[PDB]
Amino acid sequence: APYINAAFRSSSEYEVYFFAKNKYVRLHYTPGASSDTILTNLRLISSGFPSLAGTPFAEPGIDCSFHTEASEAYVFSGNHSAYIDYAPGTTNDKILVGPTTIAEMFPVLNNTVFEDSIDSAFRSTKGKEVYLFKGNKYVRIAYDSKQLVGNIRNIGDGFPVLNGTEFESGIDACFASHKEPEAYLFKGQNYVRIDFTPGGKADTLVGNIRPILDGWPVLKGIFPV
Ligand SMILES: [Ca+2]
Ligand SMILES: [Cl-]
Numbered sequence: 001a002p003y004i005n006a007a008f009r010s011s012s013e014y015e016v017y018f019f020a021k022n023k024y025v026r027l028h029y030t031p032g033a034s035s036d037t038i039l040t041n042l043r044l045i046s047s048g049f050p051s052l053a054g055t056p057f058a059e060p061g062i063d064c065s066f067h068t069e070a071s072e073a074y075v076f077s078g079n080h081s082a083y084i085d086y087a088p089g090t091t092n093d094k095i096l097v098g099p100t101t102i103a104e105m106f107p108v109l110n111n112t113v114f115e116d117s118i119d120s121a122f123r124s125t126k127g128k129e130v131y132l133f134k135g136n137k138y139v140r141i142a143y144d145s146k147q148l149v150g151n152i153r154n155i156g157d158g159f160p161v162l163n164g165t166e167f168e169s170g171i172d173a174c175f176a177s178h179k180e181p182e183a184y185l186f187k188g189q190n191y192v193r194i195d196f197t198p199g200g201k202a203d204t205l206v207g208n209i210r211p212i213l214d215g216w217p218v219l220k221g222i223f224p225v
């Protein structure tokens, strides 16, 4: 039971979506402060995103997601994917593409460890790049061309600061902060903050690791879900 199974940052400034099982919350956050606030109380994914009702993303829920551009995002559940427009503040949310399987959405992932499911992913600052994580492996993909960038690598090799930590063999969830170029990584009950610089994964800065319920105290008594 990882506390947070998926996360992606909103088109709304300093807002983020955290998913756990078939449910989610929408938070307003402030880097540097423990002052985070719930804007949308824990509820069914299908309630917050009606276009997802009757799909793997509603039940059992979203296990990986990343922000792309505008109010669009990629979501996953097992071996399934959808490109969606969540249209913040309106009844106009919709699936642009899918549901389809991961390999159908991204043929470059066919016959890889990513085909059957993806642990987590976050939006890079460079071009249209996105970091995908599955076990102890990661790879960058450009979401527009849908082509891979670089080789599939061990997290520990691509990110030496994460080598030896609990993130080395996997990342349960993560998202790109509105404060660039930072990201948050989540593993089990813990999380950490990073400062990354595209191309130079080796030059990643990492903070000390903390329990989720201490860094985001507002989730206390709500998470684990
Ligand atoms: Ca996950
Ligand atoms: Cl994620």
Ligand code: NA
Pocket: 007, 008, 009, 065, 066, 067, 121, 122, 123, 174, 175, 176
């Ligand atoms: Na993201």
